[PDB]
Amino acid sequence: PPELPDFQILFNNYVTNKSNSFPSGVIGRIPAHDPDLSDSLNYTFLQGNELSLLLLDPATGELQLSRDLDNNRPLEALMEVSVSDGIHSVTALCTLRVTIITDDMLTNSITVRLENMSQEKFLSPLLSLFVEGVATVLSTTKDDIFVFNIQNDTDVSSNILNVTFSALLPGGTRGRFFPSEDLQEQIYLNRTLLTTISAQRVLPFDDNICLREPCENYMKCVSVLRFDSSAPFISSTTVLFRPIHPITGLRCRCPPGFTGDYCETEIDLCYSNPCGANGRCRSREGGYTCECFEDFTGEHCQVNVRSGRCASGVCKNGGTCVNLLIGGFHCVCPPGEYEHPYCEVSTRSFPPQSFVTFRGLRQRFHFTVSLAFATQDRNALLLYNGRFNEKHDFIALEIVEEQLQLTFSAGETTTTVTPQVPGGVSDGRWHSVLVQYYNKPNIGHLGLPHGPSGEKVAVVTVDDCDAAVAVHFGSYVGNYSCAAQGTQSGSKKSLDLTGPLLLGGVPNLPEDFPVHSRQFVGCMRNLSIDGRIVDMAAFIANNGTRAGCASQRNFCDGTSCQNGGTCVNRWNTYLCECPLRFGGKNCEQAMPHPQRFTGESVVLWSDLDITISVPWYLGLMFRTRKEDGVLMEATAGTSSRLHLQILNSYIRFEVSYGPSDVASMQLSKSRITDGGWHHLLIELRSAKEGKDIKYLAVMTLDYGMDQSTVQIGNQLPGLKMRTIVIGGVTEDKVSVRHGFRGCMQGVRMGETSTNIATLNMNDALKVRVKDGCDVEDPCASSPCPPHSHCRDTWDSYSCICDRGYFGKKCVDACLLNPCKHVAACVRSPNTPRGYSCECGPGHYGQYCENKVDLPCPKGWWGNPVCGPCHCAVSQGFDPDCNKTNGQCQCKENYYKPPAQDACLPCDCFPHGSHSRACDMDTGQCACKPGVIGRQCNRCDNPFAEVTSLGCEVIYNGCPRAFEAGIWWPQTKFGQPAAVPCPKGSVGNAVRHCSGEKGWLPPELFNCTSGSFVDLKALNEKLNRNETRMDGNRSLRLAKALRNATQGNSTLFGNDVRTAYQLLARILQHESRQQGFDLAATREANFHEDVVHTGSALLAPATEASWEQIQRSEAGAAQLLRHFEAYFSNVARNVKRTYLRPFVIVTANMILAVDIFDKLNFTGAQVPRFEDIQEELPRELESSVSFPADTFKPPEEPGQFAVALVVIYRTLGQLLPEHYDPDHRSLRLPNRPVINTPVVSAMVYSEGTPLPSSLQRPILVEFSLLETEERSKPVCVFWNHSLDTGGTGGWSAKGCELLSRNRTHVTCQCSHSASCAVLM
Ligand SMILES: *[C@@H]1O[C@H](CO)[C@@H](O[C@@H]2O[C@H](CO)[C@@H](O[C@@H]3O[C@H](CO)[C@@H](O)[C@H](O)[C@@H]3O)[C@H](O)[C@H]2NC(C)=O)[C@H](O)[C@H]1NC(C)=O
Ligand SMILES: *[C@@H]1O[C@H](CO)[C@@H](O[C@@H]2O[C@H](CO)[C@@H](O)[C@H](O)[C@H]2NC(C)=O)[C@H](O)[C@H]1NC(C)=O
Ligand SMILES: *[C@@H]1O[C@H](CO)[C@@H](O[C@@H]2O[C@H](CO)[C@@H](O)[C@H](O)[C@H]2NC(C)=O)[C@H](O)[C@H]1NC(C)=O
Ligand SMILES: *[C@@H]1O[C@H](CO)[C@@H](O[C@@H]2O[C@H](CO)[C@@H](O)[C@H](O)[C@H]2NC(C)=O)[C@H](O)[C@H]1NC(C)=O
Ligand SMILES: *[C@@H]1O[C@H](CO)[C@@H](O)[C@H](O)[C@H]1NC(C)=O
Ligand SMILES: *[C@@H]1O[C@H](CO)[C@@H](O)[C@H](O)[C@H]1NC(C)=O
Ligand SMILES: *[C@@H]1O[C@H](CO)[C@@H](O)[C@H](O)[C@H]1NC(C)=O
Ligand SMILES: *[C@@H]1O[C@H](CO)[C@@H](O)[C@H](O)[C@H]1NC(C)=O
Ligand SMILES: *[C@@H]1O[C@H](CO)[C@@H](O)[C@H](O)[C@H]1NC(C)=O
Ligand SMILES: *[C@@H]1O[C@H](CO)[C@@H](O)[C@H](O)[C@H]1NC(C)=O
């Protein structure tokens, strides 16, 4: 017995006018298998195939494509197949799909490699999954995906595949494909999501061929894919697929912002003055920013704040715009961390393992980055950016050893820049960083920079710092390196950053990044790029970042320090600076008198009785600046060194019992040698683990502001502190080693801080003890050189040397003339930067490096920055443009009419005007006395004529004038004049110089156009019953006609007759065809061609033609008959051909074809303007209503019906003025007018035919052309079978007015024909 699995066939046909890639012969067989090896199975089709789409071998089951399949048309169909062994029968389904490939398709196409998945599961049943995962990632429908190639990518033996495909841009606008870079970025971002949804190991993207930079100058290298060859069908068990082989190549394009034959020159976009008077323009690579002034906002600062009103997008992040009653508006921010007046986010905090992802940088040569940060870690990452491969170009900025460092590589070498700031920057206070990168140009021999040089310069600045003086001669000035610079040279000309922007720490990828650190903790704010400030809320990714900075809250609020306590805010807390003799959090303790120590004072306690117990507290209060020395040495037990020093400006605390070192703990996390007051407390605490008792050594610095708890491990406990010493190192109580210097306050000892067991200063140790703490003023000597302000800092000072001076020597920089280009250095009495650079004319800027080349070059205009004129030369405009305004002026000989956007030549008559140039707009020549007309072409006397001497009254016929191009010659009365058709036309134009009105309106019926000369010759033979017409000739004639009819031109009477005859012949032939013999099945655009030709033919400008044309043929009548018969055949064969529903819109024609499910159709409005997204003019907003009972029966094939509706806009007034002669049926009003577009709706039901007369009427909703309401409508239909006019006519029988509002008129009709409302 057998079995078969439902299967599909995919034919990817790359149709071109050059290659007949259509395969022939055997392509495959039914995927039929049977364990029995003796039976001869019978292969027959049951249903589906009706027009022989596929040729089947009944015996072998071989499948062959039929010849009718060769066209540029996608298709889908479902076939039923039966297999029989002679005793049992099974059925199966096969879905056939044909997809067309174009050149625009192969241009926008990308390839993505997959690991461990060869041609065994990607051409079996999982391809659907991929074409979905891709849809979900792209947020698009599965139809937009078009996978056209899947070939074995086993370069050598590796399990890797190679799928190349393309995508359609969502939006409904046909013809748009995703740019390659857009696809690349969109695939790269949601990679893990795709991995999860599609269950596969997606491989990363590899480097491109442009790595070697083979292109020249400022160009751009892009890899592209073109057609190479076609392969036969690859067979599986479920799918027979035909692949198409591409081949790679390169292409160089000029990026914007550059000009020249090699784009070697750059353009400042601010020359166009976009900000206007309400702002100032900042240039940037390929763009500009506005510092647009106060009370003005908007992308072009086109919106006023105080006097404006609500506008879309001004209230960001969902802010509700409320219009103030007196003008202006307010953006109500939603409750959250949003900043007025625009509800933005600027400050963020970063806990461990949290990072954000923004958009990457795309600037090629020059850029600037700046931000502000605050943290405490010695080593941490700040910023990184690179490529997908994590190689070649990359940049990164970090903090190492409390010093900023920038490391970057342009693909060749790594370079580090390290400005030095005294005291570090890891103090928890906010700091700002600025970085600039730019490339020097190749200065040409003529002084013109020809392309970019090989020198790349990076500059780093930290906080307030002068860059020029630093970089040049900071060392010569003294110690001043707050800024730094690095330089690179190499063959590469540009810096490429493919990857996105990250912040706060790299994602924990297995690939190591070229970075010293790996993470970061802390707060940042104001990430400004090129002046523009980025909103923190507008992030692309977020792996744990939380908005705001909680540690920087003003904690002094709501807190009241005690007597003398001054509140200050500190990291995550506050601190009350207490006066002397007061302390304890909020100054809640009294301490004994402080003592001043100068390297010789040491105190000690002994002769004490203490037993090992729990707990114990040792508290001290200190302030100093020494970076070493013993603050407290306590020999617990035998020789248990409790070494509490300030080693290397950090509180170190060793505990070493006996001859062994046991434990230690340091406070390197905080430098405490600042000289400020600090309290510390040793805590000996218990901890019962199981049965044993351990201890714990918690020192709390500043009442637990800091706290470190060394686990006192089993060796350490049981050893209480026996001897206590503070002051330094001493053993013979005479010589002092490492004596302490500074100021210290009272001492706490015992189980609790409240255990005030005063040790009697008078008792114990009294050696070198100086009462008090006051110190002689170091600034009394006043040692800084002049221009100084000495400031005592508690046993230290520093020259706050006067402004305008720099470095340790505090020297004026203006003396060392940093101003460039021989510019004078003038030091104003008050200068924010201390000095100024006075410069001569022709140079502007802070250092006046910039220079203006006025006058600007030819075609270049702008002050003080030149810019292109951008004049439209093709429209007769002079290329030269206003050197101030920038307005383009037309070339001489021309004048631009007010209603026309192109200046046309004046074409004045030399004998009629004193001058020759005609006035602007009006185009009036310098008319001499006696002559009138816009071109001075008419004497006042209808009998006087123009000669060199003026308007002389000639006697004998129209003269020799130039009116209307024709030098219409002398002619008598009654006699016409036939002269050769005007220039560009052939035939014989005739005019009659009538005795009454002179020249009659010329009869151009004979005049034929050059475009129709071949067409006229081709028409002549056709009506002679000679040559015979065929489908291919039909297609070629349709295409030629559409081309000759496109554009705007005065179609002629012989031309309109020819067009009518040709359309009639074509439609008559098309009505005679059936099945695949219809030209419809071979072409896709024939519908568009015919509808466009029809719309062009019915142009209103031919009314004067039409009234003539109308006395010759029926015209619109037989044309409409041809149309309806054609569409009837289309409806009869649509299901056979499987044509997809479609709507065609032209300025005067609407065509809609749609397919409904019979069993589920519940009425609808047609054409589906709800489903129509194209911009619809308000007049065209009519409708046709099918009620829900349309399909419902009046009170397996035949499940789908079709509906086609055609709307003719102006056809009604185009029709001959013919009305029903029966006065009884039609009472003719005084001025009846067809006021509605003609609608032809046709519903076709497969199977049992519906009655010819619609047993259930259809609804139609029209609009009106003119809006006057002075009379009444009648819903009529223009019959064709009616004897009125032979071609039928308007009649009210069977249709009447149901409803009428001020904008719509709804009538009902029981016929599927042409109907309209005679309003
Ligand atoms: C990665 O995948 C996510 C989906 O998991 C993509 O998010 C989608 O992004 C678009 C564009 O921002 C969103 O469309 C817009 O949504 C907003 C809010 O509803 C709406 O106001 C706009 O009119 C528009 O519809 C879309 O909602 C969002 N999510 C979904 C369900 O698709 C994301 O684009 C992908 N790319 C990245 C960032 O890696
Ligand atoms: C395979 O199936 C077809 C379709 O049933 C068979 O065609 C029939 O042939 C017999 C004569 O042998 C006619 O009497 C029938 O009317 C035919 N049926 C149709 C609808 O065509 C064909 O004979 C079968 N072949 C085998 C292998 O038995
Ligand atoms: C986002 O951050 C989290 C941590 O908050 C990351 O999770 C860790 O990732 C590493 C590397 O895979 C693992 O070794 C850890 O076990 C993970 N959790 C812990 C406990 O840190 C996560 O990987 C980051 N981003 C993503 C989604 O990759
Ligand atoms: C970072 O951005 C903020 C934006 O708020 C700046 O704060 C403003 O600074 C200006 C100029 O001093 C003041 O007029 C505003 O009132 C400030 N707004 C407030 C209250 O935040 C801030 O100066 C920028 N710089 C840094 C490094 O913080
Ligand atoms: C492709 O390579 C894989 C390697 O596993 C192999 O199994 C498969 O049969 C190959 N297909 C063709 C047609 O080369
Ligand atoms: C300046 O820097 C040098 C580096 O060797 C250092 O020796 C000197 O003490 C510094 N001077 C000061 C105090 O700024
Ligand atoms: C530019 O236009 C202004 C305003 O019409 C005019 O004053 C100025 O002379 C023009 N400059 C030239 C000569 O193009
Ligand atoms: C062509 O033949 C038809 C049918 O006899 C006739 O009506 C028509 O006038 C003929 N056309 C010419 C002018 O050859
Ligand atoms: C369309 O007609 C014009 C005028 O004869 C001709 O120049 C042009 O090449 C034609 N284009 C096509 C598509 O045939
Ligand atoms: C025809 O006229 C329209 C008017 O909108 C115009 O847009 C179009 O460019 C014209 N085409 C020509 C020049 O034939």
**Residue to probe by mutation, ligand 4, list 338, 343, 526, most atoms within 8 Å of CB:** 526
DSSP code of residue 806: B
Number of H helices, E strands in the chain: 12, 84
Q: 10 Å Cβ neighbour count for 396?
A: 22
Structure tokens given for 376: 């405490």
Nearest to 460 by CA among 471, 452, 472: 471
Give dist(CA 678, CA 699) in Å, integer: 13
Q: Choose among 384, 409, 378: nearest CA to 507.
A: 384
Identify the residue whose C-alpha is closest to ligand 6 atom 7. 479
What are the tokens at 401?
């050893």
**Can you tell me the distance from the alpha carbon of 1317 to that of 1223, in angstroms, rounded to the nearest whole number?**
18
Neighbours of 1289 (CB within 10 A): 22
Q: Is the CB of 432 under 6 A from ligand 4?
A: yes
- Regarding beta strands 89-100 and 7-13, do their DSSP bridges make them parallel or antiparallel, or are they unpaired? parallel
**CB distance 543 to ligand 2 below 6 Å:** no
Distance CA 1131, CA 1136 (A): 10
Long-range contacts (CB closer than 8 Å, 24 or more residues apart) made by 305-312: 305/341
Q: Which of 1235, 1185, 1175 is nearest to 1210 (CA)?
A: 1235
**Closest by CA position to 908, among listed 894, 889, 929:** 894
- Find tokens 């290397």 and name the residue: 648
Name residue, tokens 């100054």.
Answer: 587
C-alpha 42 to ligand 2 mean position (Å): 9
Judge if the beta carbon of residue 1028 lies within 6 A of ligand 8: no
- Residue 96 in contact with residue 107, Cβ under 8 Å? no
Query: What separation in Å is there between the alpha carbon of 489 and the centre of ligand 6?
Result: 32
Contacts of 347 (CB under 8 A, 6+ apart): 523, 524, 525, 536, 547, 548, 549
- Residue 485 pairs with which residues in a beta bridge? 459
Rounded CA-CA distance 794/674 in Å is: 10
Give the residue, out of 38, 41, 42, with the most ligand 2 atoms within 8 A of its beta carbon, to mutate for a pocket test: 42
Taken in order 517, 523, 529, 535, the sign of the CA dihedral is positive
CA distance 633 to 612: 19
| Coil/strand/helix, residue 1129 | helix
Amino acid at 1104: A
Mapping DSSP to helix (H, G, I), strand (E, B) and coil, where does residue 1038 land? helix
DSSP string for residues in 326-338 = TS-EEEE--SSS-
Phi, psi (rounded to 5 degrees) for 1186 = -100, 115
Q: If you take atom 3 of ligand 6, which residue's CA is the nearest one?
A: 479
Tokens of 38: 């003796």
Residue ID of nearest Cα to ligand 8 atom 6: 1025
Structure tokens of 833?
């930067």
- 662 token code pair: 């046991």
Instruction: Residue 267: name the closest of 1075, 860, 1081 by CA.
Output: 860
Q: Which amino acid is at 758?
A: T
Whether the CB-CB separation of 1234 and 1316 falls below 8 Å is answered with: yes
Q: Are 649 and 673 in contact (CB under 8 A)?
A: yes
E-assigned strand segments in 101-159? 110-115, 146-152
Pocket test for ligand 5, best of 113, 116, 117, 118 (most atoms within 8 A of CB): 118
**Joined tokens for residue 1035:** 């297609």
Structure-derived torsion over alpha carbons of residues 1100, 1104, 1109, 1111, reported in degrees to the nearest 10: 130
Nearest to 564 by CA among 583, 549, 541: 583
Q: Which of 776, 772, 794, 792 is nearest to 784 (CA)?
A: 792
Residue with tokens 């395969």: 23
* CA 139 / ligand 1 centre spacing (Å): 8
DSSP H stretches of helix in 1046-1182: 1053-1072, 1086-1097, 1103-1109, 1116-1137
789 Cα–ligand 4 center, Å:
30
Sequence-ordered strand ranges (E) for 375-448: 380-385, 393-400, 403-410, 414-417, 431-443
Residue 360 to residues 75, 312, 354, Cα–Cα distance (Å): 42, 27, 19
Structure tokens at 359: 């958009």
Amino acid identity of 1089?
D
Decide: helix, strand or coil at residue 804: coil
Q: Which atom of ligand 2 is nearest to the CA of 44?
A: 2
DSSP calls for 470-537: HHHHHHHHSS--SEEEEEEE-S-------S-EEESS----SSPPS-S-----EEEEEEEETTEEPPTT
Ligand 5 contact via 158 beta carbon (within 6 Å): no
Among residues 26, 33, 91, 13, the alpha carbon closest in space to that of 54 is found at 26
Query: Looking at the chain, how many residues does it have?
Result: 1319
Instruction: Evaluate: CB of 899 within 6 angstroms of ligand 10.
Output: no
How many angstroms separate the alpha carbon of residue 325 from the centre of ligand 4?
A: 30
Q: Is 152 in the pocket of ligand 5 (CB under 6 A)?
A: yes
Q: Can the peptide bond before residue 855 be classed as cis, meaning omega within 30 degrees of 0?
A: yes
For helices 1053-1072 and 1116-1137, angle between their N-to-C axes, nearest 10 degrees: 30
DSSP-derived 3-state class of residue 312: coil
Q: How far is CA 618 from CA 430, 563, 590, 993, in A?
A: 35, 26, 16, 127
User: What method was applied to determine this entry?
Assistant: cryo-EM
Nearest partner of 1088 among 1036, 1149, 1133, judged by Cα: 1149
Q: Is 479 exposed, middle or buried (0-12, 13-18, 19+ CB in 10 A)?
A: exposed
Coil, strand or helix at 134: helix
Q: How many C-alpha atoms does 1049 have within 13 Å on its Cβ side?
A: 17
Nearest to 987 by CA among 964, 958, 1016: 1016
For residue 294, the tally of other CB atoms under 10 A from its CB is 9
Please report the atom of ligand 8 found closest to the CA of residue 1025.
14
Q: In whole angstroms, what is the distance from residue 1151 CA to residue 1142 CA?
A: 8
Give the separation between CA 114 and CA 147, rounded to whole angstroms: 14
H helix or E strand, kind and range, residue 1017: helix 1013-1022
Q: Give the ligand with the smallest distance to the CA of 519.
A: 3
495 CA → ligand 3 middle, Å = 31
Cα–Cα distance between 568 and 566 in angstroms, integer?
7
Tokens of 1259: 């609804």
Exposure string over 432-465, b if 16+ CB within 10 A, otherwise e: ebbbbbebebeeeeeeeebebeeebebbbbbeeb
CB 1184 within 8 A of CB 1309: no
C-alpha–C-alpha distance, residues 885 and 1061, integer Å: 56
Other Cβ atoms within 10 Å of 1109 Cβ, number:
18
Whole-angstrom distance, CA of residue 563 vs CA of residue 569: 18
User: Which resolution, in Å, applies to this structure?
Assistant: 4.3
Amino acid in position 1120: L
662 closest CA partner among 631, 689, 695: 695
Q: How far is Cα 506 from Cα 259, in angstroms, rounded to an integer? A: 39
Q: Residue 206 has what DSSP assignment?
A: P
Distance 1080 CA to ligand 8 centre (A): 28
Spatial neighbors of 180 by CB under 8 A, at least 6 apart, are 108, 109, 110, 222
Q: Which residues contact 358 (CB under 8 A, 6 or more apart)?
A: 500, 501, 502, 503, 534, 539, 540
Closest CA to 147 of 193, 194, 196, 105: 105
Three-class secondary structure of residue 249 per DSSP = strand
Q: How far apart are CA 583 and CA 495, in angstroms?
A: 58
| For ligand 1, atom 4: residue with the closest CA | 137
Q: In whole angstroms, give the CA distance from residue 1044 to residue 1067.
A: 19
Pocket of ligand 1 (CB under 6 A): 139, 189-190, 193, 540
> Encoding tokens for residue 61?
């089951």
The token duo for 1204 is: 């086609």
3-class secondary structure per residue, 895-924:
ECCCCCCCCEECCCCCCCECCCCCCCCCCC
Distance from C-alpha of 33 to C-alpha of 31, rounded to nearest angstrom:
7
Buried b / exposed e along 228-249 (16+ C-beta atoms within 10 A): eebeebbebeebbbbbbebeee
